[PDB]
Design a protein around this ligand. Structure first.
Ligand SMILES: CC(C)CCC[C@@H](C)[C@H]1CC[C@H]2[C@@H]3CC=C4C[C@@H](OC(=O)CCC(=O)O)CC[C@]4(C)[C@H]3CC[C@]12C
Ligand SMILES: CC(C)CCC[C@@H](C)[C@H]1CC[C@H]2[C@@H]3CC=C4C[C@@H](OC(=O)CCC(=O)O)CC[C@]4(C)[C@H]3CC[C@]12C
Ligand SMILES: CC(C)CCC[C@@H](C)[C@H]1CC[C@H]2[C@@H]3CC=C4C[C@@H](OC(=O)CCC(=O)O)CC[C@]4(C)[C@H]3CC[C@]12C
Ligand SMILES: Cc1nc2nc(C3CC3)nn2c(O)c1NS(=O)(=O)c1ccc(C2CCCCC2)cc1
Ligand SMILES: Cc1nc2nc(C3CC3)nn2c(O)c1NS(=O)(=O)c1ccc(C2CCCCC2)cc1
Ligand SMILES: CCCCCCCCCCCC
Ligand SMILES: CCCCCCCCCCCC
Lengths: 392, 98, 226, 53, 88, 96, 49
């Protein structure tokens, strides 16, 4: 039973309502209270901030917010939560041995590929399609012209020969008999083979339009190096990653960009990424990887940076420091942290992550199916047209 | 302050970059002290009416000992001022739209 | 491991639903349409012709006489060209060697009960280490089996793995990762693609109550952060 | 080698590290070959007419 | 089965587009046709394997260098060449 | 093939690679420097030699020297395009 | 002042590719070639049957 604020929106009456908490950190806290004989009562942070040194308006005084403000002021005695270990936090409070090793990473939109009906006709431009369609008939009729006017193959026969040479079907039982017609028809066969090979060479790529916009390399991407108005990426305001970007010597240029887009909580940033308001969200490896596993439309980027661990922070002068650290280590040695990871982090719903080429499905290739259906519906009228022609 | 007035103010900005990193490493290795200041006299350095302006103009007229920047080693400039060994290779080159 | 290729690797270019619609749903409808157009040459011969057009190997077929049937055959052959192009485009990648790890993890039945195998599993670690203490504390029976295959050092374990006298080497994650990186031919790999069980860290030991501990921790965190 | 480190830090860009539709110009050689076929077919047709006469 | 028809058949097998051909009746001629068709499979595979890369867009620079005739004498062009630098 | 790799100046190695068809460079030039006409520390020609080198650089003299001594090619065979099949690569099928 | 700007680099053997007569038969191993050759005849004769 954790007593936490009800309305997290700013400028709202925040009354401490008793809700209920459960998960990885609560299970770890229960284990700690079991091994070490002590009683606990959980209560959420006053605000949604993890903790960062901020200069208060009056007297320009350094102050801790969120968890650090709650703990260093005596309101709380222990922090069982994903609290990253770093200098600014370790100078004032003391962390136990990490109960979860993780790093910073980037969560972005999955960007499932968009497939259109004309995907099969994409490799050739409309002008090329018209040119080849005209060329087929030109070759057929001039083959007829040179065969009928030979010194020594009806129009349907010549047209069928040209069409069946173009697309391999065998609809042509008749071959040219005049020498000029034979030469033209066979070089036309070579031309049709060349066209088919050229169209086939890149057909698969145009069927599934995969793009490199998704799967950003990471912070090492020069897109991340140089911020742009079109590409907006952010993180959680007043958190460990914010401190890491503030203090880093060289990433200040993009820290300035991120300072004006920081989000209040990780859930809000994840939601903003989900509906494409945020292009990229920088956050802990554990949370982002769990969200990527749970959410099919979100994916991580890789090359974990700022490798650190979550620590159960306590006050500098505390009696539980050694015992909590030893209990964390002992739980690490046996299969307890593994059990917690399996039951809370290591369950998967949708992954769809593999280096193998994508498998064709209905969406990626349906223009060809609708083309066959259009052939059906066109033949359904062409049979009546041919019957009417035979009537005359 | 404005084009109407003929005087201004020395605004203390922060200079950093490739040439600044070179200058900082030079300061650590040679053990000297530096006072950077941007030049508004000339565009980049040129002899007009037998008068040198810009970075070279400031150096030749003893207004500054050093000229750290994107300054190209030339024939006339080397005749007027003394250059150091080149640290990056440059030259006149053509950039066109692909 | 030498690895294996699943028998379904050649069926990977299209999903099962796509195969079904292509060959039992769309093909049957196309055969019905071809026969109807020709009759306006049994249904079996139309099916045979259409299937032969699917993968044109110059199989003997009897072309329909009607013009509309010929048009339908032509558009179907265009579809078959599409199908062949899409199937052959990525067949090389799908028919490729797949490496499967011998053991899923330390909880695998091979480690826990190695006796129920015709070839006994050969695994062990160097003595006088943290890994031996951890395995002894967690799995007594596995430790009693594994101390028989006890190695002498990192290099001895690596050469035993290369020759074949040892199949698995249980050791520190960082050292094993470095050895896998340094190894030529990529013959030795860590199972689970970097799977770590005890997930501890390297620390600088100090005397109890040492005054240097706080400053060393702060400096190490500074190195991590910077 | 500090110079090299500074160059990578300050001067590296986008295009330094670095499927399209086919136009008429992209595949103009094949159509040139087809045109040569038309010309050769006409020439050999005229030659056969001359031989017959 | 004249020599022209044999050439036509073998050529058609080179790139099999189901062109109308008259197969030889002899068994040994059929064996030779089969080995040639295997050769044609080899040829088609090897030619189509890298056709995508060879048929690819090639970017040619407008000017070879500063000594190019475009820079030296830009007037002899219907579109005048537009080039310049910053002053000073 | 007594030596697998030879580390040397870009100019000499590139010239040899251009001249010799069986030798090829590797890329990513490192330790970027220049060839200098070294003289004694107390010399009278230092400024004049440096100025003459610079003047030859500005006009087209170093370019002429590069063209006439370094920038002539015999065999290159350097392209990112896939290799073109020739007699040797595909001849087993001919013998078949 | 430098009269030629250059850098360090590595010269190695060109290593022209080696092509053998059996290069066309390489993609399938000898056992696979024998298996497919046997399969062709097996299918043909029992099609006749
Ligand atoms: C025209 C009629 C005969 C139907 C067409 C045949 C295919 C649809 C069937 C026949 C055999 C079937 C295969 C036979 C057995 C394999 C293995 C089978 O189990 C495995 O994957 C083993 C994996 C391993 O051992 O590592 C999975 C199906 C699969 C691919 C089958 C896939 C479907 C197959 C090809
Ligand atoms: C009488 C006419 C309509 C011909 C009938 C053809 C069917 C008997 C064959 C052709 C294709 C076969 C399919 C081709 C491949 C698919 C995918 C395949 O799913 C897989 O991913 C491979 C198997 C595996 O992964 O275990 C399962 C069979 C199946 C449905 C096959 C089922 C049987 C099929 C439909
Ligand atoms: C026997 C005599 C009458 C020659 C007949 C040749 C024809 C078969 C035509 C048909 C299409 C013609 C081609 C269509 C257009 C192209 C583009 C053309 O390239 C351009 O001029 C710019 C691109 C563009 O045309 O839009 C070059 C000719 C060429 C290959 C043409 C060449 C001549 C072609 C092949
Ligand atoms: C821009 C676009 N967006 C699309 N979204 C979708 C989806 C998924 C529902 N399709 N689709 C498109 O197809 C287009 N392109 S189109 O409007 O120029 C166009 C229309 C129709 C055809 C025929 C071609 C022959 C077979 C039958 C359809 C071809 C091209
Ligand atoms: C190891 C080796 N080295 C080679 N050097 C050369 C070259 C350039 C002169 N060829 N060559 C080889 O061919 C082999 N491999 S082989 O001895 O097992 C072998 C022999 C013969 C054939 C037949 C196959 C059907 C067509 C006719 C030849 C096939 C395989
Ligand atoms: C890969 C599966 C091939 C299945 C081929 C079935 C062919 C049926 C022909 C029926 C003719 C009457
Ligand atoms: C008598 C039949 C002669 C056939 C000649 C065909 C020539 C085809 C040339 C194709 C060049 C790409």
């Amino acid at each position: 039973i954790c007593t936490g604020p009800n309305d997290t929106s700013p400028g709202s009456p925040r009354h401490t309502v008793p809700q209920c908490c459960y998960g990885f950190c609560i299970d770890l806290l229960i284990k700690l209270a079991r091994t070490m004989n002590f009683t606990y009562e959980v209560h959420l942070v006053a605000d949604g901030k993890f903790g960062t040194q901020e200069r208060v308006n009056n007297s320009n005084k350094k102050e801790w917010n969120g968890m650090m403000g709650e703990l260093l002021s005596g309101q709380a005695d222990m922090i069982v939560a994903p609290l990253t270990i770093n200098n600014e936090r370790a100078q004032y409070i003391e962390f136990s041995k990490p109960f979860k090793y993780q790093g910073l990473t980037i969560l972005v939109k999955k960007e499932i590929p968009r497939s259109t009906l004309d995907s099969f006709m994409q490799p050739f431009q409309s002008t090329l399609w018209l040119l080849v369609g005209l060329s087929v008939h030109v070759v057929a009729v001039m083959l007829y012209l040179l065969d009928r006017f030979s010194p020594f193959l009806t129009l349907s026969s010549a047209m069928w020969f040209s069409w069946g040479v173009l697309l391999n079907s065998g609809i042509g039982e008749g071959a040219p008999r005049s020498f000029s017609a034979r030469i033209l028809g066979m070089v036309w066969a070579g031309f049709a083979m060349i066209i088919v090979a050229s169209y086939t060479a890149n057909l698969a790529a145009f069927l599934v339009l995969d793009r490199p916009e998704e799967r950003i390399t990471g912070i090492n991407d020069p897109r991340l190096r140089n911020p742009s108005d079109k590409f907006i990426y952010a993180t959680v305001k007043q958190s460990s990653v914010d401190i890491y970007f503030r203090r880093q010597v060289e990433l200040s240029t993009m820290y300035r960009h991120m300072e004006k887009h920081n989000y209040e909580s990780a859930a809000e940033a994840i939601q903003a990424v989900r509906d494409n308001k945020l292009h990229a969200f920088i956050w802990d490896s554990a949370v982002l990887e769990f969200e990527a596993s749970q959410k099919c439309d979100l994916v991580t980027t890789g090359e974990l940076f700022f490798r650190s661990g979550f620590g159960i922070g306590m006050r500098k002068d505390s009696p539980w420091k050694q015992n909590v650290s030893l209990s964390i280590l002992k739980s690490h040695e046996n299969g307890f942290m593994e059990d917690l990871d399996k039951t809370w982090v290591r369950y998967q719903e949708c992954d769809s992550r593999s280096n193998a080429p994508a498998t064709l499905t209905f969406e990626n290739m349906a223009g060809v199916f609708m083309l066959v259906a259009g052939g059906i519906v066109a033949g359904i009228f062409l049979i009546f047209i041919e019957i009417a022609y035979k009537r005359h | 302050i404005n084009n109407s007035t003929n005087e201004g103010m020395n605004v203390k900005k922060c200079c950093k970059g490739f040439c600044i990193d070179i200058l900082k490493k030079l300061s650590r290795t040679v053990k000297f002290t530096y006072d950077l200041y941007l030049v508004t006299n000339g565009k980049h350095g040129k002899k007009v009416n037998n008068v040198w302006n810009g970075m070279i103009g400031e150096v030749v007229y003893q207004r500054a000992v050093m000229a750290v920047g994107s300054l190209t080693i030339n024939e006339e400039r080397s005749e007027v001022v003394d250059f150091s060994v080149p640290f990056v290779e440059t030259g006149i080159s053509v950039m066109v739209s692909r | 491991s030498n690895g294996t290729v699943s028998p379904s690797a050649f069926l990977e270019p299209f999903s099962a639903s796509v195969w079904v619609m292509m060959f039992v749903m769309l093909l049957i409808v196309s055969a019905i349409a071809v026969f109807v157009f020709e009759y306006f040459f049994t249904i079996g011969k139309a099916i045979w012709l259409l299937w032969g057009l699917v993968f044109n190997n110059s199989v003997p077929v009897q072309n329909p006489k009607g013009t509309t049937s010929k048009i339908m055959v032509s558009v179907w052959a265009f579809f078959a060209v599409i199908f062949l192009a899409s199937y052959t485009a990525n067949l090389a990648a799908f028919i490729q060697e797949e490496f499967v790890d011998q053991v899923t993890g330390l909880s695998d039945k091979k480690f826990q009960r190695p006796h129920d195998y015709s070839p006994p599993f050969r695994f062990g670690t160097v003595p006088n280490g943290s890994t031996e203490r951890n395995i002894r504390n967690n799995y007594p029976y596995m430790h009693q089996y594994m101390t028989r295959f006890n190695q002498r050092g990192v290099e001895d374990a690596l050469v035993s793995l290369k020759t074949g006298k040892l199949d698995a080497f249980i050791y520190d994650a960082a050292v094993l990762n470095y050895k896998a990186g340094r190894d030529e031919g990529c013959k030795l790999v860590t199972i689970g693609s970097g799977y770590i069980f005890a997930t501890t860290g390297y620390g600088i030991a100090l005397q109890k109550g040492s005054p240097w501990k706080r400053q060393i921790d702060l400096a190490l965190l500074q190195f991590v952060g910077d | 080698g500090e110079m090299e480190e500074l160059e990578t830090l300050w001067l590296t860009g986008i295009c330094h590290n670095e499927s399209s539709q086919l136009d008429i110009d992209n595949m103009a050689g094949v159509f040139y070959m087809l045109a040569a076929a038309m010309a050769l077919s006409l020439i050999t047709f005229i030659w056969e007419h001359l031989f017959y006469w």
